[PDB]
């Protein structure tokens, strides 16, 4: 099938540049445009421009004509978008997309790339086990920058009664929590571990919850 695989999250300083990638597979790379789309939480969706891989022909939104530079490398089947002179306004999830037949544009999407523009330092999370029929267990993930953090329970095995909450930003540090409700017979008899992953600091922390 057609697949668009984008690069990992980035933290980049205001005034600097960042370059994101979109690896395409399952079709002829030079046969389709690669579109770029911007997603901010309160701004919605914005089309940035396209690249036609091979010629490297390009088209931009007036809004992004100086801000974005789009290229593609046919040998590695990957399109690129460079963002220059970065401001916190450029912080967004950036997608790559591809159209299908005739009028079915934006049929195929990438998974998204979170770009964070800030002068704040990359900080790993501090993870704290939360312990007290069904029993609710928790996991406190405090003091990290930037987003995101991914939390799994038992390496994603207890993904039934899990409620992972959105992080809150406070003085350049994020903090969130994840709860997991399991039957009382299972805990503490069988082990429960909160797995926390923070790509920016390349840190992984496994915290076993104990009575």
């Amino acid at each position: 099938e057609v697949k668009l695989q984008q690069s990992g999250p980035e933290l980049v300083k205001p005034g600097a540049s960042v370059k994101i990638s979109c690896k395409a597979s399952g079709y002829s790379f030079t046969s389709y445009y690669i579109h770029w789309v911007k997603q901010r939480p309160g701004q919605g969706l914005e089309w940035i421009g396209w690249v036609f891989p091979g010629s490297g022909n390009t088209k931009y939104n007036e809004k992004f004509k100086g801000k974005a530079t789009l290229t593609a490398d046919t040998s590695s089947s990957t399109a690129y978008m460079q963002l220059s002179s970065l401001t916190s306004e450029d912080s967004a999830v950036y997608f790559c997309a591809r159209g299908n037949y005739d009028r079915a544009w934006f049929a195929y999407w990438g998974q998204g790339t979170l770009v964070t523009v800030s002068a704040a330092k990359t900080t790993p999370p501090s993870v704290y086990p939360l312990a007290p029929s069904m029993v609710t267990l928790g996991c406190l993930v405090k003091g990290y920058f930037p987003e995101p953090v991914t939390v799994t329970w038992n390496s994603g095995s207890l993904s039934s009664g899990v409620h992972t909450f959105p992080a809150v930003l406070q003085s350049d540090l994020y903090t969130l929590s994840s709860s997991v409700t399991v039957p009382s017979s299972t805990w503490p008899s069988e082990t429960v571990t909160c797995n926390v992953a923070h790509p920016a600091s390349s840190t992984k922390v496994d915290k076993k919850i104990v009575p």
Binding site: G44, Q111, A167, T181
Partner: protein
Amino acid sequence: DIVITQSPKFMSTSVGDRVSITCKASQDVSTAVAWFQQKPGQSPKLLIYSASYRYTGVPDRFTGSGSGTDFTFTISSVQAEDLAVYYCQQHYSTPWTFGGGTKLEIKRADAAPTVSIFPPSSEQLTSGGASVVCFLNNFYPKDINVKWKIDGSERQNGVLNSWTDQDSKDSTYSMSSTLTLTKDEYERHNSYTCEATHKTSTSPIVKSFNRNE
């Protein structure tokens, strides 16, 4: 720049009901309008293209109609899985602009929250911090109040709340309340209470602990 106004911004609907979203264009864009569905943490999904044409594999409950400046998107009978943000887009003239979205919420029966309080862990205390975490899980509707009566006195400082995205299965919300303070602030008091005031019960659900038990 062709501006697109999508209405409404938010919508609450029960499983089985019909819902219509409208998409207005500032100028004539013929039938070059597409409809996208985006669930939390996922990329947008193409449902309708060419105003009225259903994309491959999408269910027959989703429809689109319209020409020129007025466009409509309809779910004939809403499923629990239809919880998402729905966008329209024009592709008649560049730049291809999207609507502001319509967030679709699911109506369900009222649910009282399962409340649980957590004292700061010994490992956090070690670091000089003290965060009291109160979980309020699986409730409906989203509107909920939390008060922090520390030794009978209310606390509004250091209290941070966070709602989860509505559950795709049982249509419920969960919400965490975190009271953060310094270690020695935690050591000066004893009785910590998080009370959940919700419309389902006049008597608020209390959960408490003492520092050393």
